Amino acid sequence: LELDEQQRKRLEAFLTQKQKVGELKDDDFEKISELGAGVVFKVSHKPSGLVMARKLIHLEIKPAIRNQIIRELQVLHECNSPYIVGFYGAFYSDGEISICMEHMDGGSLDQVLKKAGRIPEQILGKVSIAVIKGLTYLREKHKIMHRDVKPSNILVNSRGEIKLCDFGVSGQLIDSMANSFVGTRSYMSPERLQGTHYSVQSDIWSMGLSLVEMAVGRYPIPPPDAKELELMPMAIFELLDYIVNEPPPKLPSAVFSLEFQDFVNKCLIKNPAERADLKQLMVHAFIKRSDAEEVDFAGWLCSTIGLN
């Protein structure tokens, strides 16, 4: 699984630190500040001084399905890879589900994007590598797909790592909560929107649409006006109908290399049959380039936002 040594030694350190903190209850945690809402808050755990992140979601429903949810989520203890956020534990408290996970110093690429304004091509290559590796790990090891890929669920630390949060491990939690929400943007593939059976193909599309947004600093649909692009009020159904019935976004041709332009074009093919899978994407020209490059990520991150 192309598992590097420095990576395997930081996985071991956190797995053995995992049992050091052990099991839990409620009053072990203490608030720090507002990470944001879609709620997750920065937290201090008092048995082990390490600070973790606790996400609370409000679900009053029948306790029988509540117990099914907790037991399905414990599979996250088996999910451990250098490209997926460190998971600590899951418990029910006060009819408020809490997930305790790694704290990521730099937050979400959504936050990154607002402070950074735009993301350079050189570095988008590395995040793209991480996602395809994570998704094959996920599809191969436990046979699941993510179902909710977007910038606010990609997290970065000053340690220079990249990992993804909020992937779809529990089916019950999806049918009982996750489905009911609709935001102001949509990252859903065109074949999911028409309700056919979808696969990780749908996830490839999400990654592609997310990459456009970060590369130009603007949510890409509907496409920016022609003069607006050089310088750099719509209801939700008109958004969805554009995605299904109009051409897909594309990167601007003057600024980015072919390999980048071609990578996203293959991710954004409407027909998931012709869209690249992960095997094809891992051997793509753009991937071979960035994997072999030399970027110091930690430096970029800390000078973008002001950490150390």
Binding site: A37, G38, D175, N179, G195, I236, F237, D241
Partner: protein
């Protein structure tokens, strides 16, 4: 409204156990001597217009009485606190009733239940009241008798972020006119409910009488929104498993993409009559 303004003689009504929350306050069981259902609302708005329109709707509901519409009894408003008192329905919701193993539906029982609902809706429409929330969970079945609840109620402007959260069961009953206008920060009161939108929701209840399930399996709400508002999803489901031509004719009529081509409830009585 001090509840002494209503034709039902009132000395005292006592709250009982709660029986479910929702976007529109909390509904308790209560004893008027008979049992009743009491919905407690609160008006954030606190604006004279909201209570003026509330007063308008609750006075209109006073004028209603029909064996297929739940009996509206009283309403009192000590602002910001409000309460709506209706007759308590013994028996099971039609929703939980078709989903029972033991239950025996047939080509006849379905048509009878459907004609009951239409008489209730037909009355309500004649008096110019739009339900705005017809669905399987707001119709009650106790032995022979069928009662519609929770009508008119979407017109009010009481307490309910910059996201939206839409249950799947509700979306299935919503006509395309409505879901195209949905968008965060838009209240339910601004949506285009109507008599046609009510007959579309009757379309979904009739499908539920045939198939004892949603016409669309639980899925992401964005998916449902596209499929509902494009009309594609309802056209595809009509393809996928068929029932009977005469049965399906009323379904296709009610779900008609252009709202103006949808039948009235009086007409729907005739169509349901000329059946097996």
């Amino acid at each position: 409204v001090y509840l002494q303004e209503w034709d039902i003689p009132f000395e005292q009504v006592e709250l009982g156990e709660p029986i479910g929350q929702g976007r529109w306050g909390r509904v308790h069981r209560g004893r008027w001597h008979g049992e009743v259902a009491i919905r407690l609302l609160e008006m954030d708005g606190h604006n004279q217009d909201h209570l003026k329109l509330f007063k308008k709707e609750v006075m209109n509901y006073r004028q209603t009485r029909h064996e297929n519409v739940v009996l509206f009894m009283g309403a009192c408003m000590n602002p910001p606190h409000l309460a709506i008192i209706t007759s308590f329905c013994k028996g099971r919701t039609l929703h939980s009733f078709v989903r029972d193993p033991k239950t025996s539906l047939d080509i006849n029982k379905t048509r009878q239940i459907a004609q009951e609902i239409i008489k209730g809706m037909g009355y309500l429409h004649a008096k110019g009241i739009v339900h705005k929330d017809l669905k399987s969970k707001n119709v009650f079945y106790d032995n022979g008798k069928v009662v519609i609840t929770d009508f008119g109620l979407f017109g009010i402007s009481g307490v309910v972020e910059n996201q939206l959260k839409l249950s799947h069961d509700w979306l299935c009953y919503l006509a395309p006119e409505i879901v195209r206008e949905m968008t965060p920060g838009k209240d339910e009161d601004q949506l285009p409910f109507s008599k046609a939108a009510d007959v579309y929701a009757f379309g979904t209840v009739w499908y539920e009488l045939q198939a004892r399930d949603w016409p669309l399996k639980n899925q992401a709400a964005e998916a449902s929104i596209w499929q509902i508002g494009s009309g594609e999803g309802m056209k595809r489901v009509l393809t996928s498993v068929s029932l009977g031509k005469e049965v399906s004719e009323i379904l296709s009529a009610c779900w008609a993409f252009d709202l103006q081509e949808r039948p009235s409830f009086s007409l729907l009585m005739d169509m349901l009559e000329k059946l097996p």
